[PDB]
Amino acid sequence: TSHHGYQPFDMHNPFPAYKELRQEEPVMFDERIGYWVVTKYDDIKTTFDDWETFSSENAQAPVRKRGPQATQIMTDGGFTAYSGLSARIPPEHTRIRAIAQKAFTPRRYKALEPDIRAMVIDRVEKMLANDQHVGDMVSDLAYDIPTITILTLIGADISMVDTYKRWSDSRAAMTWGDLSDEEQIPHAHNLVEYWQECQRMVADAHAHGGDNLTADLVRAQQEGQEITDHEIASLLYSLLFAGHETTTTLISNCFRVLLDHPEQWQAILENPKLIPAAVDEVLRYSGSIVGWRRKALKDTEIGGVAIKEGDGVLLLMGSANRDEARFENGEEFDISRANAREHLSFGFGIHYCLGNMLAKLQAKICLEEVTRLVPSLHLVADKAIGFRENLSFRVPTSVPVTWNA
């Protein structure tokens, strides 16, 4: 009953609280986290657009202050990473991003769609063959696929899938979790390991070359592009976290939300050409990220409310995606929604998601082939899906399902 019901870290059903915030206090200061909480769509899209007033430099600063022990651990481990791009500000961001998109060329996207599809069918069949005819859409399908894709694109061993998810859970907990000074210690070590592997791969590209993003970036350095080895390594640190966890969550939510609405799963079975629009509606209705942070570089206003220089802003895009002023019946999941692409789950402006297409790519491929091979798929029960507490990432821990077999 406090802060209009908003619980910053509970990710199981924040949408009722989002709804009353939009009506009662659209720009609310939450002392429990230190942020101005913004919930209406215009307000949020405007804040994204004016990057010159609202810096993103705190997007990767931890919500809870790093404790003495994690600070010593990461310092003694040589951890010098902050942010590949998402918390970089111009001129550094502009300069580094343009070099990144000259290696993130969308031909690589569409060139190896077939090996994505061949890998889904592999995973779908192994799920359909086991003692119990019950599966988990996260571990059985959505855990591997985007991870292997991003490891193949950058040049990591695809045998290290469990190391990179262990490093992802750490980064997602260290930075947006409600961690104590003890609880940072195990993730502190993981981030040190993760940063040292990012640096090990960059030195590898100098020495032995390759055929991949890591090689291409160093290859652009050798050809005169203004990007250092600390920035090459920071670009891997960004892509080897953001490049799969959000996409794992999107795939898991595709089956979570479509199986909660069997009528639209049934329409997806009828017509697999509706699948792309379904993904657009899942992204609006259940985004992987519900909140993203910014920092006021000067005294300003959001929606009439005065905000001091240096104040932190939390843009609740999960709330914006249901604003009745932009989405009629915003709280209903409807894959036929005409303007679902107006959603802000990939952001807006100079930090827009670099791999939005690569994520939607694998989301559509997973629906296309799971609806075909397993058209009778459905949830086990109604109350069997929990979400890890976080400020930004709303990750379902499991999507338990069964089928006709």
Ligand X SMILES: CCc1cccc(OP(=O)(O)O)c1
Q: Which is nearer to ligand X, 123 or 187 (CB)?
A: 187
Cβ atoms of 216 and 103 within 8 Å: the answer is yes
Q: Does 87 bind ligand X (CB under 6 A)?
A: yes
Q: Rounded to the nearest whole angstrom, what is the least distance from the CB of residue 89 to ligand HEM in the complex?
A: 10
Q: Which is nearer to ligand HEM, 232 or 354 (CB)?
A: 354
Per-position x/- string for 42-61, each x denoting binding to ligand HEM as judged by CB under 6 A, each - no binding: ------x-------x-----
Among 318, 330, 347, 396, binds ligand HEM (CB under 6 A): 347
Coil, strand or helix at 54:
strand
Nearest CA to 318 among 249, 216, 243, 272? 249
CA distances to 74, 137, 349 from 318, rounded to whole Å, are: 33, 23, 17
Q: Does 174 bind ligand X (CB under 6 A)?
A: no
Q: Does 176 bind ligand HEM (CB under 6 A)?
A: no
N-term to C-term CA, the chain: 46
Instruction: Say how far apart CA 288 and CA 210 lie, in whole Å.
Output: 32
Instruction: Say how far apart CA 12 and CA 1 lie, in whole Å.
Output: 17
Q: How many residues bind ligand X (CB under 6 A)?
A: 14
Q: Rounded to the nearest whole angstrom, what is the least distance from the CB of residue 58 to ligand HEM in the complex?
A: 11
Name the binding residues for heme b: 93, 97, 294, 348, 351, 353
* CA atoms within 13 Å, Cβ hemisphere of 389: 8
Among 289, 314, 316, 385, binds ligand HEM (CB under 6 A): 289
Per-position x/- string for 215-254, each x denoting binding to ligand X as judged by CB under 6 A, each - no binding: ----------------------xx--xx---x--------
Name the binding residues: 93, 97, 294, 348, 351, 353
- Give the E-state strand segments of 174-321 in sequence order: 291-296, 300-302, 305-307, 312-316
Q: Which is nearer to ligand HEM, 21 or 344 (CB)?
A: 344
Cα dihedral 378, 379, 382, 387, rounded to 10, equals: -140
The DSSP bridge pattern shows strands 35-38 and 312-316 to be parallel
Tally Cβ neighbours within 10 Å of residue 243.
24
Residues in contact with ligand X by the rule CB under 6 A: 1-3, 60, 83-87, 237-238, 241-242, 246
Residues in contact with ligand HEM by the rule CB under 6 A: 48, 56, 85-86, 97, 150, 238-239, 242-243, 246-247, 250, 287-289, 292, 345-349, 351-355, 358-359
